């Protein structure tokens, strides 16, 4: 499916989505915060804080 | 082939021996999944080329 | 593609808000 960063999240242990599927095919699973969506959100938040840090410096 | 030769040893038919091969393993034995079969400006997912695999 | 386009424009407007406020030409007196 042309997924490029999905396997790097999968590689280190992120395997499930907040919508309840996992890439191993297991349905009905609670990944906690550290889902594919949570990792993405974290990088967006982190990107915004570094933006502000850059203006200050 | 190893697994087929084994099943026939244990006395299964050709149909049985081959029906025991997982689809996942056969799908690996297909040149469309060979990473060296593409082109520089053939863009997108592999499903955009030979399509979405449905069944063996 | 249309969702990306809508969100891209909206995000450009928010960044512009940042610059218009914090990087305005400062008003100087007389």
């Amino acid at each position: 499916q042309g997924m490029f960063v999905l396997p790097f999240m999968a590689r280190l242990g992120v395997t499930g989505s907040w919508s309840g599927w996992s890439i191993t095919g297991e349905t009905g699973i609670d990944p906690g915060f550290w889902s594919f969506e949570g990792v993405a959100l974290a990088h967006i938040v982190l990107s915004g804080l570094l933006f502000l840090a850059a203006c200050w410096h | 082939n190893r697994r087929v030769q084994a099943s026939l040893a244990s006395g299964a038919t050709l149909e049985e021996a081959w029906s025991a091969i997982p689809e996942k393993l056969a799908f690996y034995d297909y040149i469309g999944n060979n990473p060296a079969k593409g082109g520089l400006f053939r863009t997108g997912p592999m499903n955009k080329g030979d399509g979405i695999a449905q069944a063996w | 593609m249309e969702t990306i386009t809508y969100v891209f424009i909206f995000a450009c407007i928010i960044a512009l808000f940042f610059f218009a406020i914090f990087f305005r030409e400062p008003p100087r007196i007389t």
């Binding site: - | - | 593609m1 249309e2 386009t5 424009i9 450009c12």
Partner: protein, 33 residues
């Protein structure tokens, strides 16, 4: 959704062309002073 395929280029040029125009005018104003 089955949206008009040229809507993307319409929108991109609609933003890009007049924005670039303004940026050109602003920057050459700043290098005057």
């Amino acid at each position: 959704m089955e949206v008009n395929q040229l809507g993307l280029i319409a929108t991109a040029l609609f933003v890009l062309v007049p924005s670039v125009f303004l940026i050109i005018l602003y920057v050459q104003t700043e290098s005057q002073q």
